[PDB]
Amino acid sequence: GLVPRMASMINIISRLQEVFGHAYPDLENPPLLVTPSQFGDYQCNSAMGISQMITKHLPDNECIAGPGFINVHLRKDFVSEQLTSLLVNGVQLPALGENKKVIVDFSSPNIAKEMHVGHLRSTIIGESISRLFEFAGYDVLRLNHVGDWGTQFGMLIAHLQDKFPDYLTVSPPIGDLQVFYKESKKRFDTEEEFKKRAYQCVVLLQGKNPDITKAWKLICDVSRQELNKIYDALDVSLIERGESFYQDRMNDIVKEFEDRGFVQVDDGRKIVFVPGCSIPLTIVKSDGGYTYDTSDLAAIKQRLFEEKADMIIYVVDNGQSVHFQTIFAAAQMIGWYDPKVTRVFHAGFGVVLGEDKKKFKTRSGETVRLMDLLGEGLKRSMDKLKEKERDKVLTAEELNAAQTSVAYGCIKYADLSRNRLNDYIFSFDKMLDDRGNTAAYLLYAFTRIRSIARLANIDEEMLQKAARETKILLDHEKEWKLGRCILRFPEILQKILDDLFLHTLCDYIYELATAFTEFYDSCYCVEKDRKILKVNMWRMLLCEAVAAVMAKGFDILGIKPVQRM
């Protein structure tokens, strides 16, 4: 019968913002600046604000210099209890006022076209943002807006009809879709009569023609197949919803702009100018055919009205910033959404680079095939393990557990740890390094923090009992630093909800890992006879709660921490 008012953490900054919130009277909205103090534990800075436009109104709560800094020290009664509440109840954020729906649109690869590294950024940023929003209690619809209705399907469907003539009955052992697309593209660039066929195959395909459609499905089935491998590997779940899903919807989209008089004719192109935007939406071109603008219009309508989303997040490359801004402007123009009522956001991200700070390419400058890139990430992860753990760690503990946890772990972390807007240097070396701010490090770091109570005959059940019984003592400085850090988690995950900048959680997890090594350096794991005299339970419990939070952090970034390495 649980109630909103909690067995879940407390965003301390949110609290202090309430405390000073009531603090002087009669104004319009004043600053409520509460920040961590790297001094005290937090500082307040409204002393610089409201001048112009002596905290005597300071109320009482159970949690409670220079130019205008109100250095704030947290009550140690309050902080210790919490760390316990985190252990008694596990790591959990306050849930919401509601179960608002959040749609994250990401990855969105084009079928028969090669999955490229920019898609990879997207999958990575997209998976993590969803998990943040999920862990924050939102209803998260992960949609994969797959490219599956382009003109390129024409040459493909025509080619399939040829090569596997009995495709409707049995067939087809298409095998590799890229080899196929490649063969089709050439017959298309050579055979003039085939080229004519291809275009008719799209006309027939848009025309909801029976036999042709099935031939399309089959081709989409070979790539749906090929992608699942990439999505398996990267641990990403996606409700598929490609550009075909809006075929019938796109028709009522052009009518709708027409009837409210937003469409204009030029070269037979139906186009929509949206005041303020530098470019126009082209919704139907001269040759009666639809464009991205048309499907993007239909989709955002489908997400806002049918899906009834409370927030839409487009994780798309920074190059399409003007494109989606204009789609977003159109949508307000026609009254599909009030932007004060519904968040429609473009989580944009920079382009991937090589180490030469030039665009990220290959051997000759070709397309980097993700499936190879992952494969390399795994090998190097393997080759890195052969010194010398291959035998120290066992069958499955290694076969994947450390290998995949590190490969896939680093790829995601090397991206996410940087501000997504900036361009991104892809460095196997730099990311796999065992030192400093990497996953190789933090995954290993996590092992140690759990190599403590394991190497002390302290089972989980005791710790479980110990949590609700032991009072977690917090008097040394270094345990105080570590403790105030641990409880910063909610104020971190809260900010990312507002601005989607995951590089801050990464900072925190590094800031927490390091804040831990300051604690084991030193507060004594167990006291020994110069045999064992005493079991520091609170210092054992301190290693948990660090590892708890570090573990939830890992999970949001979409990193799978392993137990041994």
Side-chain angles (χ1 to χ4, degrees):
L2 241 178
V3 168
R5 57 179 282 178
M6 199 207 71
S8 61
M9 246 144 151
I10 293 191
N11 201 124
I12 86 90
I13 300 194
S14 307
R15 177 60 52 83
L16 296 186
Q17 258 166 213
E18 289 199 80
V19 158
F20 293 86
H22 297 178
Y24 307 36
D26 178 30
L27 273 89
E28 288 232 285
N29 284 343
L32 282 76
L33 192 58
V34 185
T35 101
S37 301
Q38 58 288 12
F39 49 94
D41 308 310
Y42 293 87
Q43 48 170 255
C44 180
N45 321 110
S46 309
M48 294 58 164
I50 46 75
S51 50
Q52 137 241 324
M53 292 157 57
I54 34 168
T55 48
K56 61 206 170 202
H57 290 21
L58 193 269
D60 224 313
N61 193 309
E62 69 294 336
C63 54
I64 303 99
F69 295 148
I70 299 177
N71 254 285
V72 165
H73 284 93
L74 274 167
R75 186 160 146 278
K76 175 68 251 167
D77 293 42
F78 173 95
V79 174
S80 181
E81 296 167 74
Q82 297 303 332
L83 275 96
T84 269
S85 176
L86 176 165
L87 288 153
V88 169
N89 306 277
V91 171
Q92 289 169 33
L93 286 174
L96 313 178
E98 275 133 332
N99 275 320
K100 301 185 179 96
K101 191 176 201 180
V102 164
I103 298 184
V104 176
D105 181 316
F106 67 100
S107 198
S108 300
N110 192 340
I111 292 166
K113 282 281 208 62
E114 190 51 58
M115 194 156 175
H116 70 324
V117 177
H119 282 148
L120 173 64
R121 286 210 79 183
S122 183
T123 310
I124 289 171
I125 301 197
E127 177 51 61
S128 167
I129 293 187
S130 295
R131 291 186 183 198
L132 176 62
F133 273 80
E134 275 169 343
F135 183 70
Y138 282 96
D139 202 23
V140 175
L141 192 59
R142 300 128 161 270
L143 300 180
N144 190 2
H145 205 272
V146 308
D148 69 334
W149 218 242
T151 174
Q152 53 198 359
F153 270 176
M155 57 181 87
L156 287 173
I157 295 173
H159 190 21
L160 173 89
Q161 283 182 325
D162 294 335
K163 184 157 187 173
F164 307 108
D166 49 341
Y167 73 84
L168 286 170
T169 51
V170 285
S171 291
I174 303 185
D176 188 86
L177 190 47
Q178 311 303 119
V179 159
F180 190 87
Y181 182 76
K182 179 65 150 296
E183 290 176 359
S184 112
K185 184 64 173 66
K186 277 314 175 197
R187 288 191 66 181
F188 187 84
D189 292 332
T190 60
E191 305 173 2
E192 182 67 11
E193 209 65 34
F194 174 88
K195 190 179 185 323
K196 295 202 187 101
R197 264 182 84 208
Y199 286 106
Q200 287 186 341
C201 279
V202 169
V203 184
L204 284 166
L205 174 62
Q206 291 165 358
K208 240 170 166 61
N209 165 285
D211 302 10
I212 286 280
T213 282
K214 169 74 178 302
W216 156 84
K217 255 142 193 168
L218 301 182
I219 305 173
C220 287
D221 284 348
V222 186
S223 98
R224 201 170 319 209
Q225 155 92 31
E226 284 162 19
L227 270 36
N228 285 343
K229 291 191 194 311
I230 298 187
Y231 289 134
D232 274 12
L234 288 163
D235 235 279
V236 162
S237 57
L238 287 162
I239 298 306
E240 186 186 291
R241 190 169 297 175
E243 49 180 355
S244 46
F245 176 84
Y246 307 97
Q247 183 62 17
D248 307 289
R249 288 200 193 76
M250 274 193 274
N251 300 317
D252 311 331
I253 287 305
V254 175
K255 287 194 307 166
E256 196 188 336
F257 274 80
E258 281 182 333
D259 307 336
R260 279 194 278 276
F262 294 115
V263 197
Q264 166 191 116
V265 186
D266 170 67
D267 285 342
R269 296 177 307 158
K270 291 195 202 175
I271 72 102
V272 169
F273 277 110
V274 201
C277 308
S278 47
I279 32 89
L281 301 188
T282 305
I283 61 181
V284 182
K285 342 151 207 78
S286 28
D287 48 341
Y290 288 158
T291 87
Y292 290 158
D293 308 355
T294 324
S295 81
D296 281 356
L297 273 167
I300 191 160
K301 195 195 177 178
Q302 136 74 17
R303 298 175 163 175
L304 285 159
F305 275 96
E306 313 190 25
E307 294 296 340
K308 299 209 173 188
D310 279 282
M311 176 158 185
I312 308 169
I313 295 174
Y314 294 85
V315 193
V316 216
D317 84 83
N318 249 335
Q320 298 217 28
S321 325
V322 176
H323 182 271
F324 286 98
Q325 273 215 99
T326 301
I327 299 291
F328 299 175
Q332 310 176 34
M333 184 181 60
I334 206 172
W336 285 342
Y337 82 91
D338 186 334
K340 274 183 185 160
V341 176
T342 312
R343 282 193 79 177
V344 175
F345 187 119
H346 165 220
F349 56 92
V351 54
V352 198
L353 302 170
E355 288 176 336
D356 47 24
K357 296 186 183 178
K358 97 178 180 73
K359 298 162 297 306
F360 185 86
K361 288 300 175 188
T362 358
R363 184 192 195 101
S364 60
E366 77 260 8
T367 312
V368 177
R369 196 160 67 169
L370 287 195
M371 215 42 182
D372 297 351
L373 185 85
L374 298 182
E376 188 64 22
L378 283 163
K379 163 184 170 186
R380 289 194 191 204
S381 204
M382 184 62 98
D383 286 341
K384 180 165 188 56
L385 282 167
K386 298 314 203 83
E387 298 77 0
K388 215 184 174 53
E389 303 288 287
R390 39 170 177 179
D391 41 47
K392 153 109 179 208
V393 147
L394 50 102
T395 64
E397 274 193 338
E398 199 262 306
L399 175 152
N400 276 332
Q403 190 197 6
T404 61
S405 186
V406 168
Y408 302 139
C410 286
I411 300 181
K412 315 186 189 186
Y413 192 80
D415 188 321
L416 284 166
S417 35
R418 321 287 144 72
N419 192 311
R420 46 159 219 258
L421 300 183
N422 308 352
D423 287 338
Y424 171 56
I425 309 153
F426 190 82
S427 180
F428 277 139
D429 286 349
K430 262 166 201 61
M431 71 176 194
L432 281 171
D433 187 73
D434 302 277
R435 310 164 298 107
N437 190 3
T438 57
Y441 169 69
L442 291 171
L443 285 195
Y444 176 83
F446 183 76
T447 282
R448 288 308 312 260
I449 305 186
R450 298 198 46 66
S451 84
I452 294 184
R454 178 176 70 84
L455 276 46
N457 196 24
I458 308 188
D459 49 75
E460 208 73 19
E461 173 179 320
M462 298 184 59
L463 300 153
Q464 289 208 23
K465 197 194 76 187
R468 48 186 65 257
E469 281 170 18
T470 300
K471 198 177 79 170
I472 192 119
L473 89 85
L474 236 278
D475 295 71
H476 183 206
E477 49 153 358
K478 230 109 269 290
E479 58 187 9
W480 173 256
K481 172 191 182 151
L482 172 146
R484 60 201 194 87
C485 173
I486 283 181
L487 282 54
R488 277 206 290 273
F489 201 60
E491 82 197 55
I492 304 315
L493 301 192
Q494 184 66 358
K495 199 56 187 295
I496 310 192
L497 288 161
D498 309 314
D499 64 37
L500 312 195
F501 286 117
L502 291 157
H503 64 276
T504 79
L505 169 63
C506 289
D507 284 342
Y508 168 99
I509 295 173
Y510 184 86
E511 174 199 345
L512 172 67
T514 271
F516 171 83
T517 30
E518 286 184 24
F519 150 98
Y520 186 74
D521 291 337
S522 205
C523 279
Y524 299 100
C525 50
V526 50
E527 280 174 334
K528 321 146 304 169
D529 179 23
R530 179 179 299 146
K531 296 184 75 85
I532 297 324
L533 279 301
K534 184 53 173 52
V535 48
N536 298 110
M537 220 51 217
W538 80 97
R539 291 175 186 189
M540 280 303 178
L541 253 42
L542 277 187
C543 287
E544 306 289 289
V546 154
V549 162
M550 261 199 48
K552 203 77 219 217
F554 274 158
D555 189 51
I556 299 184
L557 308 173
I559 291 173
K560 203 177 179 193
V562 70
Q563 280 302 329
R564 282 172 76 192
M565 280 173 74

